[PDB]
Amino acid sequence: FFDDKQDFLEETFAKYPPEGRRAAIMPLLRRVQQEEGWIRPERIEEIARLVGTTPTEVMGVASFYSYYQFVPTGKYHLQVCATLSCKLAGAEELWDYLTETLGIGPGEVTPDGLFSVQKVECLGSCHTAPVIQVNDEPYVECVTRARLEALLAGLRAGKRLEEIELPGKCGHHVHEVE
Amino acid sequence: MVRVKVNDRIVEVPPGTSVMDAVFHAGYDVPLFCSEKHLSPIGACRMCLVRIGLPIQWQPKLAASCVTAVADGMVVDTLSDVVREAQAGMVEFTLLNHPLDCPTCDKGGACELQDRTVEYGLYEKYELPVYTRFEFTRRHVDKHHPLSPFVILDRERCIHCKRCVRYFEEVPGDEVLDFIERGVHTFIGTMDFGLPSGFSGNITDICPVGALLDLTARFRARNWEMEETPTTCALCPV
Amino acid sequence: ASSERELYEAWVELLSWMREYAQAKGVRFEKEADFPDFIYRMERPYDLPTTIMTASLSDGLGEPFLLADVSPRHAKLKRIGLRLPRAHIHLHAHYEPGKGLVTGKIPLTKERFFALADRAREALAFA
Amino acid sequence: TGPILSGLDPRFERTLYAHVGKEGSWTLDYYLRHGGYETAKRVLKEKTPDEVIEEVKRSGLRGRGGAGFPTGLKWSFMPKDDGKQHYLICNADESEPGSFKDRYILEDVPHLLIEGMILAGYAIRATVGYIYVRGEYRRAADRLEQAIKEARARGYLGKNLFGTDFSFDLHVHRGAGAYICGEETALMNSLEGLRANPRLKPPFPAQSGLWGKPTTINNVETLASVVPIMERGADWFAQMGTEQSKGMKLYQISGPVKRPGVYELPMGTTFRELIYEWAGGPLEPIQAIIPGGSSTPPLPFTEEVLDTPMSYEHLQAKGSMLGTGGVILIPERVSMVDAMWNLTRFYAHESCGKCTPCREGVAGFMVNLFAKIGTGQGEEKDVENLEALLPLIEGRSFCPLADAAVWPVKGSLRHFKDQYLALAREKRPVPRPSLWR
Ligand SMILES: Cc1cc2nc3c(=O)[nH]c(=O)nc-3n(C[C@H](O)[C@H](O)[C@H](O)COP(=O)(O)O)c2cc1C
Numbered sequence: 001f002f003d004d005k006q007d008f009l010e011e012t013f014a015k016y017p018p019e020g021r022r023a024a025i026m027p028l029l030r031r032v033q034q035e036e037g038w039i040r041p042e043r044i045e046e047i048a049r050l051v052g053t054t055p056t057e058v059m060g061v062a063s064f065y066s067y068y069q070f071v072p073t074g075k076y077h078l079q080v081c082a083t084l085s086c087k088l089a090g091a092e093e094l095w096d097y098l099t100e101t102l103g104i105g106p107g108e109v110t111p112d113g114l115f116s117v118q119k120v121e122c123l124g125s126c127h128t129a130p131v132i133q134v135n136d137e138p139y140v141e142c143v144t145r146a147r148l149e150a151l152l153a154g155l156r157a158g159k160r161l162e163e164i165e166l167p168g169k170c171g172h173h174v175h176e177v178e
Numbered sequence: 179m180v181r182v183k184v185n186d187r188i189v190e191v192p193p194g195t196s197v198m199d200a201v202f203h204a205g206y207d208v209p210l211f212c213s214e215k216h217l218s219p220i221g222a223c224r225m226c227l228v229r230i231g232l233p234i235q236w237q238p239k240l241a242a243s244c245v246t247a248v249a250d251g252m253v254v255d256t257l258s259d260v261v262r263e264a265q266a267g268m269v270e271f272t273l274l275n276h277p278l279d280c281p282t283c284d285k286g287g288a289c290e291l292q293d294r295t296v297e298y299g300l301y302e303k304y305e306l307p308v309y310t311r312f313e314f315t316r317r318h319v320d321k322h323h324p325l326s327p328f329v330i331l332d333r334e335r336c337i338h339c340k341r342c343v344r345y346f347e348e349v350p351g352d353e354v355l356d357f358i359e360r361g362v363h364t365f366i367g368t369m370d371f372g373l374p375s376g377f378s379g380n381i382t383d384i385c386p387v388g389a390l391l392d393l394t395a396r397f398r399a400r401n402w403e404m405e406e407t408p409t410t411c412a413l414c415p416v
Numbered sequence: 417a418s419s420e421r422e423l424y425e426a427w428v429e430l431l432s433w434m435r436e437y438a439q440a441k442g443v444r445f446e447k448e449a450d451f452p453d454f455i456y457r458m459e460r461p462y463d464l465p466t467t468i469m470t471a472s473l474s475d476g477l478g479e480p481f482l483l484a485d486v487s488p489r490h491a492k493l494k495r496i497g498l499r500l501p502r503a504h505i506h507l508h509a510h511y512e513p514g515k516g517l518v519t520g521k522i523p524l525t526k527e528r529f530f531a532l533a534d535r536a537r538e539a540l541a542f543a
Numbered sequence: 544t545g546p547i548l549s550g551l552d553p554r555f556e557r558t559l560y561a562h563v564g565k566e567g568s569w570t571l572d573y574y575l576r577h578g579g580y581e582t583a584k585r586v587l588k589e590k591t592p593d594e595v596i597e598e599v600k601r602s603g604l605r606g607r608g609g610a611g612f613p614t615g616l617k618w619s620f621m622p623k624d625d626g627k628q629h630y631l632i633c634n635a636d637e638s639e640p641g642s643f644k645d646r647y648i649l650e651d652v653p654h655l656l657i658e659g660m661i662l663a664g665y666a667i668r669a670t671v672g673y674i675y676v677r678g679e680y681r682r683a684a685d686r687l688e689q690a691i692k693e694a695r696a697r698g699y700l701g702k703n704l705f706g707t708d709f710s711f712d713l714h715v716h717r718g719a720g721a722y723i724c725g726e727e728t729a730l731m732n733s734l735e736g737l738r739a740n741p742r743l744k745p746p747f748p749a750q751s752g753l754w755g756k757p758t759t760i761n762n763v764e765t766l767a768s769v770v771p772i773m774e775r776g777a778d779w780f781a782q783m784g785t786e787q788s789k790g791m792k793l794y795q796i797s798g799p800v801k802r803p804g805v806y807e808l809p810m811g812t813t814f815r816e817l818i819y820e821w822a823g824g825p826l827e828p829i830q831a832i833i834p835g836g837s838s839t840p841p842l843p844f845t846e847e848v849l850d851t852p853m854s855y856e857h858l859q860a861k862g863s864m865l866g867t868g869g870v871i872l873i874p875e876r877v878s879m880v881d882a883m884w885n886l887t888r889f890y891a892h893e894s895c896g897k898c899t900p901c902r903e904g905v906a907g908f909m910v911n912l913f914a915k916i917g918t919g920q921g922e923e924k925d926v927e928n929l930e931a932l933l934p935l936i937e938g939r940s941f942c943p944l945a946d947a948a949v950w951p952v953k954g955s956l957r958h959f960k961d962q963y964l965a966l967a968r969e970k971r972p973v974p975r976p977s978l979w980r
C-alpha cells in the first residue's frame with residue numbers, strides 16, 4: 001500500500017525522532033482510512049514492518065481508537081453525536097430516525113452501499129447541536145429534521161458534501177436560535 | 179537504610195523499596211494481582227491499596243503500595259476498616275464480570291483470584307450476608323481458544339493485570355500479545371500466531387487466573403492432586 | 417413477561433442461523449460456553465430451550481469474527497447480544513410483542529444477520 | 544472605574560477571541576497587520592527565559608485545560624540547563640462534553656497559538672513542540688498545518704528565530720477519537736505510538752515525558768493566553784478576576800438557551816451574566832447547570848447559583864468546580880437521571896481499561912444501574928448501591944477519569960436523590976420529551 005506514496009512516509013517520519021518511529025503508527029493508520037474506507041489486517045501487517053515493531057503491537061494500538069473502522073464503511077459514514085449536550089438538542093430522535101429510515105445498524109452498510117452509521121462522542125460544537133460529522137470532514141452542524149433530509153437527499157444525488165445547500169442558517173462560535 | 183513502621187512493626191529497609199515489599203517484609207499482607215516478581219510494577223488493578231501517614235499526618239487518598247516508594251518515618255496502615263472496606267470492594271469489582279468456571283476451570287486451587295477473594299473479599303460491616311451485588315449480564319466472549327500448541331487462552335477469565343503482555347516486551351523482548359479494544363470490552367489478543375519467542379511458556383506461570391493455561395497439561399489433574407517434585411532441568415547447561 | 421420465554425426461543429433460532437451460515441460458507445461454528453445456571457443447577461428445575469449461552473463463528477485460526485450470547489435466565493436487563501471482535505461493534509437485540517426480534521426499532525431477520533456475518537467474515541477472518 | 548474587573552466592565556479588553564469570526568483571520572498577513580509576532584520578537588531579544596516564567600508566575604495564569612494548576616509554577620519545574628532536548632505540547636485534544644473553546648482558537652487564529660508556543664517554548668528551553676488535535680477537528684487541523692507552513696516560510700519558525708540564537712519548530716499530530724488522550728500523560732503515549740494509557744506519575748512528565756525527554760504540557764487556551772500576558776504586562780492580566788482566579792476565561796455555554804457558543808469574559812463574571820446577558824437566557828425552564836466541563840458536578844438552578852462568580856474558588860467552595868468553563872443548562876423537561884445515565888455511559892465508553900475500579904466499576908456496574916433504574920426496572924435498592932459504589936471508586940483509580948465519572952453522579956444524588964427514587968418507586972422509565980426541530 002505505502003510502496004506507492006513514498007513521499008508521504010518520508011515526510012511524516014520526519015515529524016518525530018529517529019527512535020520513536022512508532023509515532024507514525026497513528027498517521028499511517030489515518031491515511032489507510034481516508035483512502036480505503038477501513039483498515040485491513042494486511043495494512044496493519046505492513047504498517048508494522050514499516051514502523052519497526054510487531055503486527056500485534058500495531059493491532060492493539062489501532063483497535064484502541066474510535067475513528068478507525070475495521071469493517072467496510074459506506075461512501076458516506078455518518079457519525080452521530082450522542083453525548084449530553086446534543087441529547088438536549090434531540091440527538092436521540094435523530095439517531096432513531098436516521099437508522100429507522102436507512103434501516104442500518106452500526107455494524108452494517110446500506111444496500112445501495114454509501115451509508116454506514118456510528119454513534120460518537122461530543123464533537124466539540126455543542127452550541128450548534130445536534131451535530132453530525134460525515135467522513136473525515138467538517139461537521140454538518142445543526143441537523144434539524146428538515147436540514148437532515150437535505151443533507152441526505154444531497155449526498156444521495158452524488159453532490160459532493162462541501163457544496164450542498166443546507167436549508168436554514170447556522171452560526172460559527174455563537175449561534176442564534178429562533 | 180530507612181525507618182518504616184508498617185502496622186505495629188517497625189522495619190529497616192533500603193531507600194528505593196516498594197511500600198508493598200515493605201509490608202510483606204514486616205510480615206504482613208495485601209491483595210496482589212498485577213505486580214510480579216521481575217516485572218515492572220504499575221498500579222493497575224488497584225488491590226494493594228494501603229493508607230499512609232508521613233510526619234502522623236494521614237494522606238487523603240489510599241495508595242498503591244506496589245508503586246509508592248518508602249520514605250523515612252512512614253506509617254503504613256493495612257488494617258483500618260477504611261482499608262479492608264476498599265479491598266473488599268476492589269475484589270467485588272474484579273469478580274463482577276468473571277465467568278463462574280472454578281469447578282471446571284483448570285486453574286484449580288492454585289489461582290490468585292480465588293485466594294484473594296476468600297482472603298480479603300466480602301466485607302464484615304458493624305443479617306443474611308450478600309455474596310453478590312451485581313445482577314446483570316456478565317461479559318461473554320471467546321473461550322478455550324489455543325494460541326499455539328502449548329498455550330490455550332481463555333479470554334473470559336482474564337482480569338486485565340498486565341502480567342503477560344508486560345512480560346513479553348520485557349523478559350524475552352518479543353511483543354506477541356496485547357490488549358485489543360478499550361473499556362469493559364478490552365481483551366488479550368495477537369497477530370503473531372505461533373507465539374514465536376522461545377519463552378512463551380512463562381505467561382502460563384504468571385497469569386493470576388485461568389486465562390493463560392498450559393495446554394500441554396490441560397485437564398489431567400486438579401492442582402492439589404498433583405505430586406510435586408522439585409528438581410533441575412538438564413536439557414541444557416543452565 | 418412471558419416475552420422472556422419468547423426471547424430464549426428466538427435465541428435458539430439465532431443459533432440455528434449461525435450453524436447454518438457456518439456449514440454453509442465453510443467456516444467453524446463453536447459453542448463457547450453453556451449456562452452456569454444449568455451446569456450447577458441441581459435438583460432445581462430447568463425449562464429453557466437450550467444450554468448454550470455463548471457462541472461464535474470463528475475462522476481458520478479459531479479467531480472469532482462474530483460473537484453471540486444471551487443473558488442467563490436468572491439475570492436482569494435481558495438481551496441477546498452480537499459482537500464483532502476487534503472492530504468495536506456491539507448490537508443489543510431485544511424482543512417486542514408482535515413486531516419480533518429487534519435491535520432498537522429495526523428488525524433482526526435471518527437476512528440482516530447473514531449480511532452482518534458476511535461483512536465480518538470477509539473483512540475480519542485471518543485465515 | 545476604580546478597582547477590579549469582573550464582567551461587563553467598560554475597561555474590559557477582549558484578547559483571545561478578539562479576531563475570531565473575522566473574515567480572513569488566519570492569514571499570516573492578517574496576524575501581522577494587527578501587530579503580529581511582534582511580541583514574540585521583543586521577548587526573545589530582550590527578556591531572558593527565566594524572566595518570562597516569572598512574568599507568567601506573576602500573572603496568575605491557571606491551566607485552562609480544566610486542571611487549574613498555576614502555569615507559571617508548572618514551567619518552573621522544567622530542568623534548568625541540562626542539555627537534554629525539551630518538548631512543549633499543546634493539548635488540543637479538546638473532547639470533554641460541553642466544552643468547545645479551543646476549537647475556534649485553532650480554526651481562526653492559529654498564529655496566536657504559534658506565537659504563544661514560541662514564547663512558552665523559549666520559556667522552558669523547548670526547541671520543538673507538537674500539537675495534539677482531536678482527529679475530529681478537521682478544519683482546525685487543516686488551518687494549523689497551513690499557518691505553521693506560512694510561519695515556517697517567512698521565518699517566524701525554525702532555523703534561528705529573529706536572528707536570536709533560539710530555534711523552534713512545530714508539528715501537528717492528529718488523534719483519532721478517545722477522550723482519554725486528553726490526560727497529559729496519556730497524550731504522550733498516544734502520540735508516542737503506543738496504546739493510549741495514562742502513565743505512572745511517580746516519574747513525572749517534567750523530567751521524563753515525550754520519548755523520555757523533559758516535556759511540559761499546556762492547553763490551547765493556556766498557551767494562547769501567554770501572548771497577551773507577555774504583551775501588556777502581567778499586571779494587566781491581574782487587574783482581571785478574583786483573588787485566586789486571575790485573567791480572562793473563554794466561557795462557553797450550550798443546551799436550551801437563546802444564543803449558545805463561546806464568550807470571552809473576565810474570570811469571575813457571574814453565571815447570570817453569561818446565561819442571560821450574552822446567551823440571551825433559557826428557552827425552557829432550567830433545573831441544573833454543569834459549571835465547568837461535563838466532569839463537573841451539576842448545580843441546581845437557584846438564585847444563589849446564578850449569582851455565583853465563575854472562579855476557581857467560588858465554584859470550588861460551592862460543591863462543584865470550574866472545569867473548562869463550558870456550561871451546560873439542563874431543562875426540567877428531561878430527567879436528571881436521564882442526564883447522568885448519559886454522562887456516565889460516556890465515561891464508560893471512554894475508559895481506557897487499565898483500572899479495575901473504572902473498567903469494571905464505572906463501565907460495568909455503574910452504567911448498568913442507570914439502565915435498570917432508568918427503564919423503571921429499578922427498585923429503591925438499586926439507588927442505594929449506585930450510591931455506595933461511588934466512594935469505592937472516587938478515591939483510587941489510576942487516572943482522574945473515574946473521579947470524573949463519579950463526581951457528577953455523586954453530585955446529582957446530593958441535589959436530586961428524589962428524582963431517582965421516583966422512577967424506581969413508581970417503575971416508570973425516564974421521560975422522552977420531543978427535543979429536536
Ligand atoms: C482524564 C482526563 C481527560 C482530560 N481531557 C482533556 C481534554 O479533552 N482537553 C483538554 O484540553 N484537557 C484535558 N485534560 C486535561 C489535561 O490534564 C490538561 O490538558 C493538562 O493538565 C493541561 O495543562 P494546563 O491546564 O496547564 O493547560 C484531561 C485530563 C484528564 C485527567
Ligand code: SF4
Nearest residue numbers: 279280283289387388
Ligand atoms: S480463574 Fe480462578 S476464580 Fe476464575 S474460574 Fe478459574 S479457578 Fe475460578
Ligand code: SF4
Nearest residue numbers: 336337339341342385
Ligand atoms: S491473560 Fe492473565 S496474565 Fe494476561 S492480562 Fe489476562 S489475567 Fe493478566
Ligand code: SF4
Nearest residue numbers: 895896897898901942
Ligand atoms: S480511571 Fe479509567 S480511563 Fe483512567 S487509567 Fe483507569 S481505567 Fe483508564
Ligand code: FES
Nearest residue numbers: 085086122123126
Ligand atoms: S454534545 Fe454533541 S457536540 Fe458536544
Ligand code: FES
Nearest residue numbers: 212213224226244
Ligand atoms: S498490585 Fe499494586 S495495584 Fe495491582
Ligand SMILES: [Ca+2]
Nearest residue numbers: 006007008010
Ligand atoms: Ca520524492
Ligand SMILES: [Ca+2]
Nearest residue numbers: 323474478479
Ligand atoms: Ca475459538
